[PDB]
Amino acid sequence: RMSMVVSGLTPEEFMLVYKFARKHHITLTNLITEETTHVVMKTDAEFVCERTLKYFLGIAGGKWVVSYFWVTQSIKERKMLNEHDFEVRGDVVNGRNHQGPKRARESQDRKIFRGLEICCYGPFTNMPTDQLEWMVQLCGASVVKELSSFTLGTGVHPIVVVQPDAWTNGFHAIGQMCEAPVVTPEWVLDSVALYQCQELDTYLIPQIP
Numbered sequence: 018r019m020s021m022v023v024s025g026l027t028p029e030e031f032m033l034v035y036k037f038a039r040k041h042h043i044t045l046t047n048l049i050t051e052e053t054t055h056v057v058m059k060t061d062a063e064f065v066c067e068r069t070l071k072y073f074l075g076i077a078g079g080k081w082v083v084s085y086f087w088v089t090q091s092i093k094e095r096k097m098l099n100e101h102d103f104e105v106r107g108d109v110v111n112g113r114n115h116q117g118p119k120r121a122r123e124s125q126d127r128k129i130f131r132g133l134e135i136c137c138y139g140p141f142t143n144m145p146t147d148q149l150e151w152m153v154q155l156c157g158a159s160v161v162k163e164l165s166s167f168t169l170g171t172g173v174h175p176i177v178v179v180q181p182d183a184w185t186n187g188f189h190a191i192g193q194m195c196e197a198p199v200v201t202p203e204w205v206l207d208s209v210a211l212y213q214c215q216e217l218d219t220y221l222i223p224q225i226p
């Protein structure tokens with residue numbers, strides 16, 4: 018009916034959130050799933066959090082993404098306060114005032130990656146490939162697993178995502194094996210924090226033609 022996960026807390030802080038749940042009758046899980054309604058981030062006084070995977074998947078899902086002060090307040094006042102009044106404004110990498118989760122929460126009709134074909138190519142450390150894929154799918158994109166498996170005809174646009182630093186002979190040769198733009202994960206990541214497709218320009222990768 019209403020389910021939660023948390024990111025960046027401490028055993029103590031978690032203890033607190035459990036209390037919250039216990040009282041207000043909220044479900045609590047370790048893993049974030051389609052069902053998870055809420056994601057609670059540790060933040061600074063101005064509601065800036067670290068960029069965590071739960072952060073990202075949270076936004077992708079359009080779920081509620083609130084600062085930890087949501088909790089301590091609803092405790093400090095024996096009442097569940099307004100999700101709205103505690104949301105997350107930004108994060109350490111993308112700026113402290115970019116108000117992402119709000120959009121996504123209110124942009125579920127027009128998802129940024131509506132009508133895309135995305136292939137997360139090669140090894141992904143930092144993040145399980147399939148979690149990334151899940152992420153973009155949540156944003157309307159369609160996942161492809163094989164470079165050779167991109168659809169044809171226009172209207173649809175294909176994109177390749179690689180984590181360059183994760184390899185050990187040529188990941189610049191990609192433009193050869195297919196006719197797609199190549200970018201680093203950061204494209205996606207920012208596209209998701211901000212909830213707005215980004216200038217691949219900044220993310221493109223040199224293809225050995």
Ligand code: NI
Nearest residue numbers: 171172173174
């Ligand atoms: Ni076009």
